[PDB]
Amino acid sequence: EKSSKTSKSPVLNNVNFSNFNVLGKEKEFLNIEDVADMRVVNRVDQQSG
């Protein structure tokens, strides 16, 4: 397709991949802290623990 030099918006896509959304929750807002949990996770030297 050599789509170089063409940023493109309506130009042809022989194969295009759409976005993926959660089934059954297309219109459901909530908040970030209501579904997700936050941890830190660290890196250890393994020479001195």
Added chain:
RNA sequence: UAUGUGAUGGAACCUCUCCGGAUAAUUCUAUCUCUUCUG
């Protein structure tokens, strides 16, 4: 809610250090209570 000839992020241990310890005989004698009416 991406934009398309190129995503090892499974590509990273919240790890390391610190006596729930210290002191104490389950023992034993002095009152308690305020208004009485001329005495």
